[PDB]
Amino acid sequence: RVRSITLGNSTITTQECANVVVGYGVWPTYLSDHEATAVDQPTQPDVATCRFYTLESVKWESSSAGWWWKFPEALSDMGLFGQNMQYHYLGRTGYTIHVQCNASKFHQGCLLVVCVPEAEMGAATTDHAFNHTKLSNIGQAMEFSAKKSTDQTGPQTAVHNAGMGVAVGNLTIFPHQWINLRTNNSATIVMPYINSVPMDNMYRHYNFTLMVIPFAKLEHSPQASTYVPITVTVAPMCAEYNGLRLA
């Protein structure tokens, strides 16, 4: 029923079926080894930096609007992956994202776990430019709101517009997975490297934003647990950076 996966260290556990969703039917892979003439030569992490990075868990209460993380910026202080982001200038990588909800049989609700490529967000105070720390901190979960935002230096965090000016119910053409606590508690999304260029600066460009939005709100007896933790575990797969040597 259960299966243990190890990537260097440590081991996480998962179920035998788990409904893995590959991004656009494309498994993440390398640049097919046509790296001739030594003018634009790439470099692997060691191999590898491919280990499970677990983030700090969030608390899904009954009034939680949702959360988001911007990648690769949510793994900036994360081991060797966070050091290759400052030792190299250009980089490309793919990801495996696990989102587990540790609920009971007496908790109800539904979550939508989206991976939105190039989730360009709008400002709360329009005509104003926002701070970069109100978009993504170093590993923190930036959260949506139920009301509209009037912040003079932040983004628009109204969840029914999803920060991008669209309808939140239409966020299913992106690679997504439903977590209905009646049926599931986990979600595996495997995202490849999607960009217009084969490599880019990792500190400057957010490739995709992972979004966890509750569509049916969390509802329970008052005698149960009231916070229902959600754990996001990210393993970067097939990372690649620019060559740092001569000739």
Add this chain to the structure above:
Amino acid sequence: RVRSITLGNSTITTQECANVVVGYGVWPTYLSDHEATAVDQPTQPDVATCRFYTLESVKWESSSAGWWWKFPEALSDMGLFGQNMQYHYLGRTGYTIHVQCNASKFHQGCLLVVCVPEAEMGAATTDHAFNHTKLSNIGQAMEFSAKKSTDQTGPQTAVHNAGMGVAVGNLTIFPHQWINLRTNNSATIVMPYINSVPMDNMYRHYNFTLMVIPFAKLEHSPQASTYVPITVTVAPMCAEYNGLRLA
């Protein structure tokens, strides 16, 4: 006539013959891959940390008594090799040591370049224990003296006893090479890992001490250069450390 050797970065140059001296006829190598049962499993640097580390050059004047470096402690703030020394507890490695003297045809003298395994030194003030910084700094060249030492917290730096209580002319059963400026200017010594145990703590134990002692003193016209730099270039080969993971 010349040959360019590259180990990652950068390239150094050397002659076509150069008189390489392997330590005891034993090339440095790994532990022969009998690493079963996962109780004492080893770990390679990446591979590798095998690059040329060049130290700060010394100035061989007409009254220079000699210098010494203790290994692996002379590569402590040296790149990835200096970080694996603090990320791992046990380690083993072999070395290639290049010692070049940049002299002219108008300079004369002779040098003895020794590699002394377990060069246990005595105290200048006997009955007193010395400081570890008077034996080896982080990458600095600790130098001998012509007179005896009366330092109350240091070693005995009289060069005709070589710090170990022996005759300095008998330091040729160790892996050595003569640099006679009339004939040569370079010296390649390849030292394997010599110890009583297959791995040891690198911060605690000095495996061998490289010694550069002038036997014929430097002598020249007063119109020539008076300092004659000596460059030591060290490449650690076939390094290996203990495993840091489970099972």
Add this chain to the structure above:
Amino acid sequence: PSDTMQTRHVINYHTRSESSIENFMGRAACVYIAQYATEKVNDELDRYTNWEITTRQVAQLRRKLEMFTYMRFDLEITFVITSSQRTSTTYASDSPPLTHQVMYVPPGGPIPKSYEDFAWQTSTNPSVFWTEGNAPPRMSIPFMSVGNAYCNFYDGWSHFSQSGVYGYTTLNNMGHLYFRHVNKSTAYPVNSVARVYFKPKHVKAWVPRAPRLCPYLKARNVNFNVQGVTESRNKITLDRS
């Protein structure tokens, strides 16, 4: 939002077609602007105008040409001829369409020295007649040198050994270009501007030369003021560890 130059990783395809001599030299460049009028105002502006075909008057074309010692190309000339009236008191007229005559005079052919000259009717002088409002007229000149290639540089004289004019040769005669109105008159005077566009076709080059550092002072010399070899900085070394 501006401006940065970036590295921006590129897949291995290695284009080089935009660096060929045909793609480097073969661009339609404006080489001369000819001004002439329906009626004569002054010696400068007269019923007709002329231009000796040279390639040393537009500096952006001249520097791309003078990267090679010997060139050989065909010329594609095309004319953008516009007309406008002078600042008269009244402009109310009913004019017929203006017809322009662009005459190419070969090396060896007779040049006009006035209006109504006999050289406008020479059968060996190819002319182009074009009415205003149509597509722009276009001629095509072949390789017209007596020698085997044009020479952008001539380390020599043109007179008795060591005498004459330095650097001038008759091996770069491409001909003349004469512009006039075919109409006899108008009710009110009309000024015309004829923009001349060159497009070198089938370009071949020999003996590449160093690019010019100094600016140009004359269109028939290689004279120059002295200049620094590059721009200046403050230090030979770098700071900000």
Add this chain to the structure above:
Amino acid sequence: YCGAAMATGKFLIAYSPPGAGVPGSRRDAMLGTHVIWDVGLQSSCVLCVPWISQTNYRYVTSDAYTDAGYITCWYQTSIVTPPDIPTTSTILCFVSACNDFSVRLLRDTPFITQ
């Protein structure tokens, strides 16, 4: 190197990748990509540098922040000379491309201002 035939020395030619950056010491330069050029062995030193591609969307640039790499040279030891040879000398530098270089989008150069 255009010094005397009896001058002997070592230079450390460091290379910095397009990310960052200028090193501050000979030890920081040695800990990256470098080539130790021995004067007493070779008179010339040739090194091929990758990752040169800069795209500018303006005609003339004031001053258009760039993220190119660097080349720095460091005194590894000194230049050692015998008597009756001068202590000063001269390094010449040369640059070209390799047989893979790809240009695109031809414009007019900003070095002419007629």
